[PDB]
Design a binder for this molecule. Structure first.
Ligand SMILES: [Mg+2]
Ligand SMILES: [Mg+2]
Ligand SMILES: [Mg+2]
Ligand SMILES: [Mg+2]
Ligand SMILES: [Mg+2]
Ligand SMILES: [Mg+2]
Ligand SMILES: [Mg+2]
Ligand SMILES: [Mg+2]
Ligand SMILES: [Mg+2]
Ligand SMILES: [Mg+2]
Ligand SMILES: [Mg+2]
Ligand SMILES: [Mg+2]
Ligand SMILES: [Mg+2]
Ligand SMILES: [Mg+2]
Ligand SMILES: [Mg+2]
Ligand SMILES: [Mg+2]
Ligand SMILES: [Mg+2]
Ligand SMILES: [Mg+2]
Ligand SMILES: [Mg+2]
Ligand SMILES: [Mg+2]
Ligand SMILES: [Mg+2]
Ligand SMILES: [Mg+2]
Ligand SMILES: [Mg+2]
Ligand SMILES: [Mg+2]
Ligand SMILES: [Mg+2]
Ligand SMILES: [Mg+2]
Ligand SMILES: [Mg+2]
Ligand SMILES: [Mg+2]
Ligand SMILES: [Mg+2]
Ligand SMILES: [Mg+2]
Ligand SMILES: [Mg+2]
Ligand SMILES: [Mg+2]
Ligand SMILES: [Mg+2]
Ligand SMILES: [Mg+2]
Ligand SMILES: [Mg+2]
Ligand SMILES: [Mg+2]
Ligand SMILES: [Mg+2]
Ligand SMILES: [Mg+2]
Ligand SMILES: [Mg+2]
Ligand SMILES: [Mg+2]
Ligand SMILES: [Mg+2]
Lengths: 82, 91, 200, 94
RNA sequence: UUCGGAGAUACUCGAGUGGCGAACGGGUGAGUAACACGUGGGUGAUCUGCCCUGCACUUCGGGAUAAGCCUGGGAAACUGGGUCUAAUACCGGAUAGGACCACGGGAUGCAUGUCUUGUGGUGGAAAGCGCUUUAGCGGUGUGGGAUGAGCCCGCGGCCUAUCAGCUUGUUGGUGGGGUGACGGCCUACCAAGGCGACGACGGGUAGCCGGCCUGAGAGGGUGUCCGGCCACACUGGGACUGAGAUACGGCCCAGACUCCUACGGGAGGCAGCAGUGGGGAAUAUUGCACAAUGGGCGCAAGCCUGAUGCAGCGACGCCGCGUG
RNA sequence: GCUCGUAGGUGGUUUGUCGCGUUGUUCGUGAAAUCUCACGGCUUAACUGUGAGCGUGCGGGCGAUACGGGCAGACUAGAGU
C-alpha cells in the first residue's frame, strides 16, 4: 500500500498544527482578559505580540492569511473601543 | 496546469485527432476548453493544421503542450515563432 | 444473400418478362403455379406489392437494402420515383449490364462479384457499388482475353447503349457523363406504386 | 526594464436585477416585504398567465408603508431570506 | 586478499528521512423532488498547488530525530528504552507594503462601497544541490494572466387534497463569535413574525441532461452505449493532512459479517480489471501491450498506468458479400 | 335543483404617455458527439472526418407603437339611480 508514510507524516503535521493553534488561542484569551480589565497599558503591547504571533502562524501555514487578518482586525478594534 | 493535447476521436483503426487545449486533470476525451487544430497520421506524410493565432495565444498565456503536440508545433513553425527562433515554417 | 432460383417462375407470377435474351420466353402462358390459371381477386395492396417485387427482381436487390434505398430516395430533394430509379440504376453491376457487357443481369452481377473491374484504378468486387458522374470503369487488365468477357467484345451492337454512359474501343471502358434518368431509360414498371407501398 | 505592478485588465461591472412592486408587509424591523407580479406565456396552451412573487428587501432606515409601489435591486445574501434592497419609494401610497 | 573474506572513497542501490503525487483517472446509481440538474445571470461576498509573466530578494544562527547499533515487552499484529547521524526535515532571529489600526487625498457607484494613492503606528519569508565546464536544476515575498472551484439568484422539467395548517433559530434586528467568503452558519438579548389553495406540511416514486424510440407535427415514452454534472464506496458518525477530500484500494469510533489467536488480543471490505458462488428468462476471458494518446514523479534517459490501445467469446445488433 | 357572492378569468367608445407583453435588428451564449444537407476516406455500405444548418431558448444594446397592459384624462351607447 505504502501510504503508511503519509499516515505517519499526517500525524506529525497534526501535532505541529495543534501546538501552534493552541498557542495562538492562549495569546488571544490573554489579550481578551487584558482588554476586559481595560488598563490600556499592557494591552497596548499584548496586541502587538498577539498580532505578531498570528502573522507568524499565517506565514508558517497553520492558518489562512484571511483568518489571520480577521482576528487581527477584531482585536485591534477591540483595543480601539477601550 | 493547462495542456495542449491530442484526443482520439476516429474509429477502431483510424485514429483521427483533434488538437485541444485542456486542463491536465481531465480525461483524454473530455470537454476541451478550445479546439485549435487537428492531426491525421494517415495521409501522404500526414495531415496537420493548427489555428496559428489561437495557438500563439495559448502558448503566450501559459499552456504547456504535450510532446507530440510540441512535435506538431515545431513542424508548423508556431513554436519557433512563439519562442523567437529562425525557422517559422518547416512543413 | 441472393435468390438463386428459377427466373421464369418469378416473371410468370408478376405477369411480366424481366430477362429477355436467349431464354426470353418460356413459350407458354402465365399460370405461375398449380392454381395459376385462377381468375383471382385484385386488391389495391396487390398492385403495389407486385410493382415493388418487379423493382426488386429487375435488379436482384434484397428487401432490407431496397428499404434503405427508399429512405434515400424520399429524403432526396426533387421527386421520389425518379430518384429511386436513379439510385437503383447507378449500381455498378447495372452499369455493366447497360454498357452491353452482359447477357443478363445475373451474369453481370457475377462478373462484378468476381472482381473483373476497376473504377479509378481501384479493384472493386461489390455488386451494389454506386457509380457516379465522371466515373471511368476499367476492366482489370490482367483479366481480359477470357472467354465470357471476350464473347461480349464483338457482340456490342444489338442492345442499345443509353445516353448517360459511353463505351470506347477494344479496351472496353465506360465513361459516365452524368447520372442517368431511368424514367426516360427503360422502365418496365411504374415508380409511383413503390411510393404508395412504402406509405402503408 | 511595467517595471512595477501591472495595473489591471479593464472589465464591465455586472448588472443586478431591478424590479418594481407593491409593499405587502412592514412590521419586521428594518425589513420590507414586496410583492412582484410577472406574466409569461403558458408552455402548451399559449395563454398569458399572471403570477405573483413575494421577495424580502432591506431598509437600513425603515420608512415604507402598505401600498407604496417601490423599486428594488437584488444584492448579496443580507440574511437567510433577504436578497433585495430598497432603492426608492416612487408614487407613495394614496 | 580470504584463497572465501576484506576496502563507501567508488557508478549503483534494498530499507529509511524528505519533496511531489496519491482529491485525477476507473466503478456504480443505493440515496436525493433538492439550486441535484438544464439554461441565463451575480460574486463590491470568495479561494486557486503546479503553469505564464512583471518587480524585489535569496541574510544569520540553533536543537533534535528517522535510519544504524545495543536492548525490553508481545503468539502475532506491533511496540518501549539507551546511544548515534544528516538534510531543500524542524525551530528562533535581521531586513522585506498588498496583514492590521487611525487620519487624509484622487477616481469612479449599485446601498453596503470598490480601486489607487499619502502620513503615523504595528507586523509578516527563503534553500540549497549539481556540473566531461555558457552540464543545469532550484528557493521566498509580492502585481498581473490562465485554469479550476466555492457560494447566491431568475426561469424550466413527476404522481397525490381519501395529505389543510405548518413553523420558535422558526422570521427579522443589534453586539459578539465563526468562515476562503455573504449569511441564524453559531451565540446572548430584543421584536412577533415567516410559509400556505399560484398547494405550505405530508405520502409515493425517481439520479438530472446532451440525447434515444415513436410521431406529419404538436405531443408521448425513455435516460441503456457515448459525453457533461451530481451522489456514494460493508452500514452510521467524525475529523486530520493538504492548493484541493463522498479521501473506492487512507485514519478514528460504533455495528453486522468473515478469518487468525497462545484467549490477552488482532486482520479485512471487487459498486477497479479479470473471475467465483447466488438470484435470475437472461448478459463475456482469472487474454496481450505500454507500440499510439492521456496521466504521475524525475534535468533527462527513464519507471508506473487492468486508463487506454487491441485481442477472445455471444447472429446480441446494424451493414456488406456468398451458397454459382 | 336554484341563486348570491370571495379569489380568479374576461372586458364599451376616445386622447396622451410608458414601452412590461408583442415585434425588428445586432452582440454573447445555446460544449463535443448524435440529427439534417454537401462533400471528403475506408473496394461499397454501416462507420468515420470536414463545412453549413439546427440548437424554437436566455441575457445586453439599439429601433416600432397597431393590438394587449400600466399610468393620467374624457364620453354615454352597457350597468345602476
Ligand atoms: Mg515517498
Ligand atoms: Mg492550554
Ligand atoms: Mg471578524
Ligand atoms: Mg444481412
Ligand atoms: Mg445583519
Ligand atoms: Mg532505494
Ligand atoms: Mg521534486
Ligand atoms: Mg498531494
Ligand atoms: Mg476519486
Ligand atoms: Mg440513483
Ligand atoms: Mg440555476
Ligand atoms: Mg533509536
Ligand atoms: Mg519585521
Ligand atoms: Mg529562516
Ligand atoms: Mg435564541
Ligand atoms: Mg447576529
Ligand atoms: Mg433509486
Ligand atoms: Mg398522431
Ligand atoms: Mg452513505
Ligand atoms: Mg457489496
Ligand atoms: Mg462509512
Ligand atoms: Mg500539496
Ligand atoms: Mg488544512
Ligand atoms: Mg467518510
Ligand atoms: Mg470499497
Ligand atoms: Mg476496492
Ligand atoms: Mg487514496
Ligand atoms: Mg468485476
Ligand atoms: Mg433462470
Ligand atoms: Mg439460477
Ligand atoms: Mg503508454
Ligand atoms: Mg505516454
Ligand atoms: Mg436466438
Ligand atoms: Mg372580482
Ligand atoms: Mg373584474
Ligand atoms: Mg384587468
Ligand atoms: Mg379594451
Ligand atoms: Mg452541438
Ligand atoms: Mg467515397
Ligand atoms: Mg434581444
Ligand atoms: Mg339606461
Amino acid at each position: 500500500k505504502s501510504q503508511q508514510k503519509r499516515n505517519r507524516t499526517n500525524e506529525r503535521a497534526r501535532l505541529r498544527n495543534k501546538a501552534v493553534k493552541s498557542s495562538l488561542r492562549t495569546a488571544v484569551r490573554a489579550f481578551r482578559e487584558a482588554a476586559h480589565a481595560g488598563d490600556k497599558a499592557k494591552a497596548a503591547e499584548l496586541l502587538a505580540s498577539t498580532n505578531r504571533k498570528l502573522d507568524k502562524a499565517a506565514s508558517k501555514g497553520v492558518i489562512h492569511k484571511n483568518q489571520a487578518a480577521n482576528k487581527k482586525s477584531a482585536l485591534a478594534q477591540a483595543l480601539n473601543k477601550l | 496546469a493547462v495542456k495542449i493535447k491530442l484526443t482520439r476521436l476516429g474509429k477502431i483503426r483510424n485514429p483521427q485527432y483533434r488538437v485541444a487545449v485542456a486542463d491536465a486533470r481531465t480525461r483524454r476525451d473530455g470537454r476541451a476548453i478550445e479546439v485549435i487544430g487537428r492531426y491525421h497520421p494517415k495521409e501522404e506524410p500526414s495531415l496537420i493544421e493548427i489555428n496559428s493565432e489561437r495557438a500563439q495565444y495559448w502558448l503566450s498565456v501559459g499552456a504547456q503542450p504535450t510532446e507530440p503536440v510540441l512535435k506538431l508545433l515545431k513542424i508548423t513553425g508556431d513554436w519557433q515563432k512563439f519562442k523567437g527562433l529562425p525557422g517559422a515554417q518547416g512543413r | 444473400a441472393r435468390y438463386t432460383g428459377p427466373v421464369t417462375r418469378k416473371s410468370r407470377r408478376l405477369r411480366t418478362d424481366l430477362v429477355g435474351g436467349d431464354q426470353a420466353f418460356e413459350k407458354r402462358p402465365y399460370p405461375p403455379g398449380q392454381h395459376g390459371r385462377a381468375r383471382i381477386k385484385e386488391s389495391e395492396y396487390l398492385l403495389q406489392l407486385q410493382e415493388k417485387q418487379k423493382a426488386r427482381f429487375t435488379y436482384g436487390v434484397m428487401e432490407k437494402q431496397f428499404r434503405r434505398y427508399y429512405e434515400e430516395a424520399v429524403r432526396q430533394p426533387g421527386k421520389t420515383g425518379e430518384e429511386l430509379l436513379k439510385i437503383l440504376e447507378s449500381r455498378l453491376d447495372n452499369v455493366i449490364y447497360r454498357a452491353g457487357l452482359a447477357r443478363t443481369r445475373r451474369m453481370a452481377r457475377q462478373l462484378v462479384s468476381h472482381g473483373h473491374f476497376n473504377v479509378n484504378g481501384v479493384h472493386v468486387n461489390v455488386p451494389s457499388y454506386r457509380v457516379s458522374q465522371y466515373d471511368i470503369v476499367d476492366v482489370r487488365d490482367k483479366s481480359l482475353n477470357t472467354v465470357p468477357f471476350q464473347i461480349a467484345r464483338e457482340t456490342a451492337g444489338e442492345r442499345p447503349i443509353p445516353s448517360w454512359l459511353q463505351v470506347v474501343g477494344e479496351r472496353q471502358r465506360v465513361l459516365i457523363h452524368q447520372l442517368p434518368e431511368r424514367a426516360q431509360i427503360d422502365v418496365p414498371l411504374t415508380e409511383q406504386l413503390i411510393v404508395e407501398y412504402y406509405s402503408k | 526594464k511595467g517595471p512595477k505592478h501591472t495595473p489591471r485588465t479593464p472589465k464591465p461591472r455586472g448588472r443586478r436585477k431591478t424590479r418594481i412592486g407593491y409593499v405587502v408587509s412592514d412590521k419586521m424591523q428594518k425589513t420590507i416585504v414586496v410583492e412582484l407580479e410577472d406574466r409569461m406565456r403558458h408552455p402548451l396552451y399559449g395563454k398569458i398567465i399572471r403570477t405573483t412573487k413575494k421577495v424580502k428587501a432591506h431598509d437600513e432606515d425603515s420608512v415604507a408603508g402598505i401600498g407604496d409601489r417601490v423599486s428594488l435591486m437584488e444584492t448579496r445574501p443580507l440574511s437567510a431570506t433577504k436578497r433585495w434592497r430598497l432603492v426608492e419609494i416612487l408614487e407613495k401610497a394614496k
